[PDB]
Amino acid sequence: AGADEERAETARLSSFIGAIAIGDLVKSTLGPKGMDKILLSSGRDASLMVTNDGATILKNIGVDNPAAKVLVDM
Amino acid sequence: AGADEERAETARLSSFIGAIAIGDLVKSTLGPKGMDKILLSSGRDASLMVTNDGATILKNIGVDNPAAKVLVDMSRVQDDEVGDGTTSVTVLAAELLREAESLIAKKIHPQTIIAGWREATKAARQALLNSAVDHGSDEVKFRQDLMNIAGTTLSSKLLTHHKDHFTKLAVEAVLRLKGSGNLEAIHVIKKLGGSLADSYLDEGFLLDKKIGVNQPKRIENAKILIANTGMEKVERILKHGINCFINRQLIYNYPEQLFGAAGVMAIEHADFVGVERLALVTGGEIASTFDHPELVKLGSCKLIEEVMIGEDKLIHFSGVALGEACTIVLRGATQQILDEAERSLHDALCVLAQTVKDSRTVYGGGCSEMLMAHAVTQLASRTPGKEAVAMESYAKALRMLPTIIADNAGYDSADLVAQLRAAHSEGKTTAGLDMKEGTIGDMSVLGITESFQVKRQVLLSAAEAAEVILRVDNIIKAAPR
Amino acid sequence: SRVQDDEVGDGTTSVTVLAAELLREAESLIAKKIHPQTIIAGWREATKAARQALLNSAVDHGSDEVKFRQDLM
Amino acid sequence: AGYDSADLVAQLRAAHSEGKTTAGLDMKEGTIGDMSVLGITESFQVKRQVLLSAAEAAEVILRVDNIIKAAPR
Numbered sequence: 001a002g003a004d005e006e007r008a009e010t011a012r013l014s015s016f017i018g019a020i021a022i023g024d025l026v027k028s029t030l031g032p033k034g035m036d037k038i039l040l041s042s043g044r045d046a047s048l049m050v051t052n053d054g055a056t057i058l059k060n061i062g063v064d065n066p067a068a069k070v071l072v073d074m
Numbered sequence: 075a076g077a078d079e080e081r082a083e084t085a086r087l088s089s090f091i092g093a094i095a096i097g098d099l100v101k102s103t104l105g106p107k108g109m110d111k112i113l114l115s116s117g118r119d120a121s122l123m124v125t126n127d128g129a130t131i132l133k134n135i136g137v138d139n140p141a142a143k144v145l146v147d148m149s150r151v152q153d154d155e156v157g158d159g160t161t162s163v164t165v166l167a168a169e170l171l172r173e174a175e176s177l178i179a180k181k182i183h184p185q186t187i188i189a190g191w192r193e194a195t196k197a198a199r200q201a202l203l204n205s206a207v208d209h210g211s212d213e214v215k216f217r218q219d220l221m222n223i224a225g226t227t228l229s230s231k232l233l234t235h236h237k238d239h240f241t242k243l244a245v246e247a248v249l250r251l252k253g254s255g256n257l258e259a260i261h262v263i264k265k266l267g268g269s270l271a272d273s274y275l276d277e278g279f280l281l282d283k284k285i286g287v288n289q290p291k292r293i294e295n296a297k298i299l300i301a302n303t304g305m306e307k308v309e310r311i312l313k314h315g316i317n318c319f320i321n322r323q324l325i326y327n328y329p330e331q332l333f334g335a336a337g338v339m340a341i342e343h344a345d346f347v348g349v350e351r352l353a354l355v356t357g358g359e360i361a362s363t364f365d366h367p368e369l370v371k372l373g374s375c376k377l378i379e380e381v382m383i384g385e386d387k388l389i390h391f392s393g394v395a396l397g398e399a400c401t402i403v404l405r406g407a408t409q410q411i412l413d414e415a416e417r418s419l420h421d422a423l424c425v426l427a428q429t430v431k432d433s434r435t436v437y438g439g440g441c442s443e444m445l446m447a448h449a450v451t452q453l454a455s456r457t458p459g460k461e462a463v464a465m466e467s468y469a470k471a472l473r474m475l476p477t478i479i480a481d482n483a484g485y486d487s488a489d490l491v492a493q494l495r496a497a498h499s500e501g502k503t504t505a506g507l508d509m510k511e512g513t514i515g516d517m518s519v520l521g522i523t524e525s526f527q528v529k530r531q532v533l534l535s536a537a538e539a540a541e542v543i544l545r546v547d548n549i550i551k552a553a554p555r
Numbered sequence: 556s557r558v559q560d561d562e563v564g565d566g567t568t569s570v571t572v573l574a575a576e577l578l579r580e581a582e583s584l585i586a587k588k589i590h591p592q593t594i595i596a597g598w599r600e601a602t603k604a605a606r607q608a609l610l611n612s613a614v615d616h617g618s619d620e621v622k623f624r625q626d627l628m
Numbered sequence: 629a630g631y632d633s634a635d636l637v638a639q640l641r642a643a644h645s646e647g648k649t650t651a652g653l654d655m656k657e658g659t660i661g662d663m664s665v666l667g668i669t670e671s672f673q674v675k676r677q678v679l680l681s682a683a684e685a686a687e688v689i690l691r692v693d694n695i696i697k698a699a700p701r
Contacts, residue, residue, distance in 0.1 A: 028545075033185045033545075035185075035545050035546065036542075037546060037547070038141065038546070038548065038549075040139055040548075047136060102693075106590075106592055106593070107592035107693060109693035109694045110693065111694075111698060112697050112698050113698075114698075114699065114700040114701070122697065232691075410691060410692070481589060481590055482590055482592070482593075483590060484589055484590040484592070484593025484594065484596065485589065485590075485593075486589060487589065559677055559681050562677060563673060563674055563677060566674065570678050570682060573678070573682050574682045574685045574686055577682075577686050578686075592690075595687075598686075598687065598690075605679055605680075605683075608675055608676070608679050609676070612649070612675075613649035613650075613669075614672060615669070615672075618669075624667065625667055625669065627667065628666060628667025628668065
């Protein structure tokens, strides 16, 4: 264990996992009772940035190696 | 499995922890005998700062991932547009978070209870008037200006013998504060020389710097020169008639000889903050290279002079044409209390201006808190909805304040709550906690009355912060720093 | 202590010991269980203690001038 | 004195509550005795200054709430 290996069930899984992570944060945002979140990164970021609009925050950061940034661009 | 994983119960915990963390540090500070704390930062900071005033330190830094900075930021307007005295507004906000545990039992969406904050407007209006206390303050006012609330701020402080006189003076300082122009240019320094009054009020801004041993002792029909760049000079100088030069930064030695013979008084390394305030005061100037003299600069010509204040010499720049900015100078023999003036007077500036601006106040010594607690229990029942259930929880939050005021008086807390409530529900607004008695008494005889605004701004800010908080996820707490 | 020495003297050292013992009672102080600062008002009460050290004690009753037996010993 | 302290406390209190200011601790005796016979007296002034001096030393701990620092790192 402890390596990046993908075939069969797992290759499909990386697409699957990227979709689930984004959905939980965005679901709160929609509707009158909608919610806005705060994000903090220390590496050359002034402070916490808060974006209610899902599109603006997704464009801003390419935090991880799994596919999702391309999806965000669209 | 990303990293910061939090459960719905743990997400709220981060907000919960934040209120408790802040309350413990501010807790030492409150009432009669409070204590100073030290705080450290490097890179954007360099050493350890110690601040007696809780509001000043919270404002200056956003130390960590925990969210409370936004809650904290509102307090600055509290300390300018009203409440300061003794810090306690932050502590009450913290208290409301504890009721959230009882809220989990309420199998209802937390977002909906948030609408209770919609109710904050109808609670803030009810909280107000339920307290019912001061009929009015006309403006400036000859006798109602003080001998009131500033004394309470002082009541907490030991210095209340000579000091209460100092507190009274603060009103004169605040009277000039009101009007168009904003909250700008107010500076105060305490000094070593002793007097019964222990304070002198000056019409203009004060500074403490000297050109050198040589140079004229006094100047008149004074003209002021300010430079953004460090040290031709005589030629431009003679025609204007220049009486004083103020420079923010180091000053070159050669011009110093010139000024002495000419009869012009200059200031070496004048602090920038004093200078910026001064510009508003004198009508301002364009500060740049040595061309800066004549028309580009406009100076005020009333009085700049060195005078002796009982002993040690100072410079008193005074009689500003604008009239929007002024300075305060303190005096005293020497003790804990005299340099405690620095602790107290800064507090004095914020309390009084507001007391004159609000024209409304509430009874101190916790009189307001018990009465308000009585009225609010009924109010929850009156309103339809969860709107009623959230409101009922809020009402017992107020109960803790009576306990804290008594606690800092040395007297047994449970006994105190009992006697306190019976007197307030009775219908007498004047009655309140008497710390010196260790029981309940007439607050008015003491002369204690909290500015009305201090009570409404604290309640409204806590309410809005609460709206966002139990409808988010990522945070936590450690302390101010 | 030195100001005291100039104003009267050494005697035998004992003043320092008396001040130290007052700290021991602080353990039971917690037992009162509330605000240590108003405990200080006890000091205010010490003025009462101070008058006690006054007039309800032996004093002289004799030290007329020279004195036959009480000159010393 | 090299004498039993427990015994001493009881007898000392015993002579004083009576109302006889003369009785006191005689170390040479090992028990209690008539101080006046010894001839021992203390100046009035030594008692007032010691009381004032001991009281202020005690307050240095209480008039100032805190003196040092907390957590730089």
